[PDB]
């Protein structure tokens, strides 16, 4: 899915993205900005809006799971199996009509929140590698969702 160079860039910058809170703050900003920009998504998640307490709670769980996916990146089948299981659980989440179309704008909010945290370290190579990693992580979740 990712080249060895891309996996090494993702693994390296993940230390800076995780910070001291296992990426919790990045998760809150990712989902906050996503729902503010796409207000119709609040109903899909089951939140009142961008300021719902649940946004910060769920943002931390998303980023903690990406941290687990990053630790398994060198074994593709292992990473895919885990995320596929997360995907199967999403059949019963929110409005229970989570669509594949929703994951691409979420990816854009995620990379923006990562950049907001690590600044200049989120350079062109870092953005390409994380766009590739997000494609595979969310692609594996979507396959579980649609299984
Ligand atoms: C726009 C697409 C998405 C929607 C609408 C969505 C929705 C939800 C909802 C509503 C919950 C709360 C479940 C509960 O009440 O317990 C949840 C949990 C979770 N989501 Fe998502 N999600 C999406 C994308 C993602 C992505 C990309 C990841 C990837 C890391 C992810 C990882 C998780 C995790 C780790 C949980 C916690 C529960 C579990 O492990 O299954 N979600 N999601
Ligand atoms: C998913 N939150």
Residues framing ligand 1 (Cβ under 6 A): 44-46, 58, 61-62, 65-66, 86, 89-90, 93-94, 98, 102-103, 106, 138, 141
Q: 42-80 burial, b for 16+ CB within 10 Å, e for fewer?
A: bebbebeebebeebbebbbebbebbeebbeebeeeeebb
Instruction: Give the distance (Å) from ligand 2 centre to CA of residue 57.
Output: 9
Instruction: Give the distance (Å) from ligand 1 centre to CA of residue 36.
Output: 18
Q: Count the neighbouring beta carbons within 10 Å of the beta carbon of residue 147.
A: 9
Task: Pick the atom of ligand 2 nearest to 58's CA.
Answer: 2
Give the single-character DSSP code of 77: H
96 exposed, middle or buried (CB, 10 Å; 0-12, 13-18, 19+)?
A: exposed
Q: How far is the C-alpha of 89 from the C-alpha of 52, rounded, in Å?
A: 22
CATH number at residue 4: 1.10.490.10
Question: Which residues neighbour 20 within 8 Å (Cβ) at sequence distance 6 or greater?
Answer: none
Instruction: Name the experimental technique.
Output: X-ray
Q: How far is the C-alpha of 14 from the C-alpha of 84, rounded, in Å?
A: 22
- Residues present in the chain in total: 147
For the chain, counts of helices (H) and of strands (E): 7, 0
- In the chain, how many domains are there? 1
Resolution in Å, one decimal place: 1.4
Instruction: Name the token pair of 7.
Output: 């996996």
Q: Are 69 and 130 in contact (CB under 8 A)?
A: no
Instruction: Give the distance (Å) from ligand 2 centre to CA of residue 32.
Output: 12
Q: How far is the C-alpha of 21 from the C-alpha of 3, rounded, in Å?
A: 28
Task: Pick the atom of ligand 1 nearest to 34's CA.
Answer: 1
Q: What range does the domain containing 68 cover? A: 1-147
């Amino acid at each position: 899915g990712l080249s060895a160079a891309q996996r090494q860039v993702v693994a390296s910058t993940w230390k800076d993205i995780a910070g001291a809170d296992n990426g919790a703050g990045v998760g809150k900003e990712c989902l906050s900005k996503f729902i503010s920009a796409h207000p119709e998504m609040a109903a899909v998640f089951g939140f009142s809006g961008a300021s719902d307490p649940g946004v910060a709670e769920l943002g931390a769980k998303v980023l903690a799971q990406i941290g687990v996916a990053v630790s398994h990146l060198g074994d593709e089948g292992k990473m895919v199996a885990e995320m596929k299981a997360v995907g199967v659980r999403h059949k019963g989440y929110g409005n229970k009509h989570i669509k594949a179309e929703y994951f691409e704008p979420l990816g854009a909010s995620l990379l923006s929140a990562m950049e907001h945290r690590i600044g200049g370290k989120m350079n062109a190579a870092a953005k390409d590698a994380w766009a590739a990693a997000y494609g595979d992580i969310s692609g594996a979740l979507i396959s579980g969702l649609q299984s």
